[PDB]
Design a protein around this ligand. Structure first.
Ligand SMILES: *[C@@H]1O[C@H](CO)[C@@H](O)[C@H](O)[C@H]1NC(C)=O
Lengths: 532, 535
């Protein structure tokens, strides 16, 4: 009975496991219930605080993964499997995990909270790339990550109703953060130094906590890796979500009360069968069920909220990876596969834009093609492939990030930006995909430090540097080494200068304008072009 | 005769001429200046196509430049060499249809290839008599026969009541064509090869050359063609029949005036009245607001130049085309508010948006917005220096560079030997402000070899550069290849292809080949922007 592995949280006692990390041992506390299982009549509803428990609750292992679609594009393939649920699937999945230094911090420690991604239809805290042991050991951090409801279970809404008000996935996230205010001290965490960090939909989630007042007293700083609450994919209008819910009801055989009561009767897997039949539109970033603009959690659209908000006392780290759009190309855009070099024809390129920008009218798509064509080599299949990747990356991530970072700086937030450029040596996707969406996380989390993973010694140093940026940001609001002098400094992103940095193996490099011209195209022109 | 220099007495179809032995830097040249090629287009002849000049008797004194066609004289900057150099340098008169000839001295034994110059001036101005079109250097140094003609400009040249008998339109181009005819018949008397006639022009002159390439009755009168900073396609070079008619009418109203009766009235108005009102037809704030330009008449121009360059066959055609580094700058001072020759012309963003509406007068609210998008450097959206340069760029690109880019494109695509350049040398002698860079018109003085006149104060390096360019031009005239068939050590000038889009830089350094004539931006102007005016 190791007393370092025993904690008393409000709901009672917990027994963690001692995990080993490369340079020492860490205390883990995996699968802590933070809410009553959102099951049965609770499906679609706001999460409720977990009731207290007798005895010593075992928290030595990861709990179930929230119920979700499992990816079968590339069966057995490491590139995809690594994002797939690695524990049993269950509607009962509202559990968080805590990693702390072993022995537990003598004084209150900066807490990072991870929110995973997966476009609000997938994901799990238990995935290997979010293993919080390294940041716990090396950087002496309290690292927390929670499961939240994805897909229909978490984001299916019939706006304005009692029994499916929507955004409950985001509410799960909030309850985890509430749990952290009330409990993290018991682990050595400092509740007054909480930093949220997340990727893709996790980043957008983080973003939505920035934009929702009730969340704002649960954290102090935020990191948005490769995702935003604004942009084409992160939200839906009240009207449109209601529509999507209704067509799913109809699709499985079902007054709001009545329509929901029916859905609740249905096996979880029945709902997943038709998750991907609610947007018959050949989108890429479909996912039918995403946070809804509800006039509640989201008091207005993110664009609107972002435009008007006051971000006076707020530090934020935002970035993108070199090749956001490559990964998504293989998932429905013709001519793109992991197996060949995917050198597409020009006709395919025009075809792809109609998929990548499904919102685009003929003229709009025309413009996108006009902007992204290299008119010096308009036919070269290499440029058209790389272009297609860019159209998607930029439209869905890079520009939304640029736009967000812009407004936050404008409105008094303190912003740091990066572009992530180093392709992992262990990467199992083809070369042409470059540095794909998702492939910075393994470095931030510190995975190369595990020699058993065969990461190059240079990568193991890079990871250390990134870990030190993140935890430094977490500690102080400033990614920069607070007593190491001349490494080149990471300057804050300002709308004036527009400085970001390249995160790669070469030391920091300051660049200006994050796709300045191209983001101008997406952010200022295209909107005006579609409407009128 | 008797006592006269016998090298200076020549006979042409209209009769006898006496020329003048002119001193050029490296030796003498023969000039026959102010030969009439047409019956003076005065009185009942105004607005009418030219009639060939009826033979005269005795000897015509062809020793001095003749009258310049009646045109508007610029007074934006009085005293200023920068503008005065383009102003008429002879008397203004409707009787202006004369041409000039420069030949070696003595005139050569075998027939030399002929170069015919069509001057620019937006179709509203110009003279073959300006100092920058002096043929003496080309004649002397390159052994070439150079001809330039006067052709009617403004209302006199281009006021059209399309479909009418009394004002058909395009008479200015017909003046040009008659001069080419005159060359076919008579140039051998001067030692000229009518089997080898290369047209060259600049700006509106370029456009004119272009339109000769496009007007079949003209093709049999020349063999090669050069277009310097100008094209027949693009926004300023032509007008739809309807529009041309509207303008002609509105001008008739302005001077106080059944097509017959209307023109009959116009013909009664003094030349000066017509000039005094030719600018007031478009209050329409605009730079390349020339009211009277070539009309797409379904005759001289069978159809729009845009159509013809896209559908015509150009197998048998070698073309030289280019632009200067700063086509637009010049134009900004003629009514883009903020821009002056006398200061740095640093402008605000407000003035930029303003300038884009004047520069692109035909642009909808949305399209203008698009121009601003593409031209703003969003890294420094507020930089006076950048915005100033962007505005130059907009005007230059829209009116000259992209049309030329397009022209070079469609032609090479339809089987022509196209040669492309960008001229990047600023005259040491330039009187325009530093910020204007290498402006529109300021290559001409090099092609013509002016630097060789040591009294003009050009640097030695410039003197050498001028010679280099004169070789390029005359080589092209001679062979359809600007490259020296002898010296292959020096860098080659590759044809422009749709494949590789190769052009060369003309500057004090040897030829550098570049790919892409403003490729991305000209995509904007030539491909995207049109569709943005479709709904
Ligand atoms: C330059 O002169 C122009 C035209 O007179 C004037 O409008 C402009 O303000 C001047 N530029 C500056 C800022 O010195």
């Amino acid at each position: 009975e190791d007393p370092q592995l025993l904690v008393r949280v409000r709901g009672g006692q917990l027994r963690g496991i001692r995990l080993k990390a490369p340079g020492g041992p860490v205390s883990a506390f995996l699968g802590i219930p933070f809410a009553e299982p959102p099951v049965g009549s609770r499906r679609f509803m706001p999460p409720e605080p977990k009731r207290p428990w007798s005895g010593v609750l075992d928290a030595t292992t990861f709990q179930n993964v929230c119920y979700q679609y499992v990816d079968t594009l590339y069966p057995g393939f490491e590139g995809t499997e690594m994002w797939n649920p690695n524990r049993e699937l269950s509607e009962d999945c509202l559990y968080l995990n805590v990693w702390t230094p072993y022995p537990r911090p003598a004084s209150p420690t900066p807490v990072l909270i991870w929110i995973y991604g997966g476009g609000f239809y997938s994901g799990a805290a238990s995935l290997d790339v979010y293993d919080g042991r390294f940041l716990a050991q090396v950087e002496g951090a309290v690292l927390v990550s929670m499961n939240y409801r994805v897909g229909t279970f978490g984001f299916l809404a019939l706006p304005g109703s009692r029994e499916a008000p929507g955004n409950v996935g985001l509410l799960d996230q909030r309850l985890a953060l509430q749990w952290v205010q009330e409990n993290i001290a018991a682990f050595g965490g400092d509740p007054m130094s909480v930093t949220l960090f997340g990727e893709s939909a996790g980043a957008a989630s983080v973003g939505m906590h920035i934009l929702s007042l009730p969340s704002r007293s649960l954290f102090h700083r935020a990191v948005l890796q490769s995702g935003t609450p604004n942009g084409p994919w992160a939200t839906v209008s009240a009207g449109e979500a209601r529509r999507r819910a209704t067509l799913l009801a109809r699709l499985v055989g079902c007054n709001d009360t009545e329509l929901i009561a029916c859905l609740r009767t249905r096996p979880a897997q029945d709902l997943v069968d038709h998750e991907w039949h609610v947007l018959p539109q050949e989108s890429i970033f479909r996912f039918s069920f995403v946070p809804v603009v509800d006039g509640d959690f989201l008091s207005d659209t993110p664009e609107a909220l972002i435009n008007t908000g006051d971000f006076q006392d707020l530090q934020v780290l935002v970035g993108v990876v070199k090749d956001e759009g490559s990964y998504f190309l293989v998932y429905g855009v013709p001519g793109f596969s992991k197996d060949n070099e995917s050198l597409i024809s020009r006709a395919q390129f025009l075809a792809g834009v109609r998929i990548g920008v499904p919102q685009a009218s003929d003229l709009a798509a025309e413009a996108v093609v006009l902007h992204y064509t290299d008119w010096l080599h308009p036919e070269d299949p290499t440029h058209l492939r790389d272009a297609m990747s860019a159209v998607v990356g930029d439209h869905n991530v890079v520009c939304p990030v640029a736009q967000l970072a812009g407004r936050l700086a404008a409105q008094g937030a303190r912003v740091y930006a990066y572009i992530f450029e180093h392709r992992a040596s262990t990467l199992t996707w083809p070369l042409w995909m470059g540095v794909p969406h998702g492939y910075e996380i393994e470095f931030i989390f510190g995975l190369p430090l595990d020699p058993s993973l065969n990461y190059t010694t240079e990568e193991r140093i890079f990871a250390q540097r990134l870990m030190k940026y993140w935890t430094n940001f977490a500690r102080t609001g400033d990614p920069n080494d607070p007593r190491d002098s001349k490494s080149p400094q990471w300057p804050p992103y300002t709308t004036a200068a527009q400085q970001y940095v390249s995160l790669n193996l070469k030391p920091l490099e300051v660049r200006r304008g994050l796709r300045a011209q191209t983001c101008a195209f997406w952010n200022r022109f295209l909107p005006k072009l579609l409407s009128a």
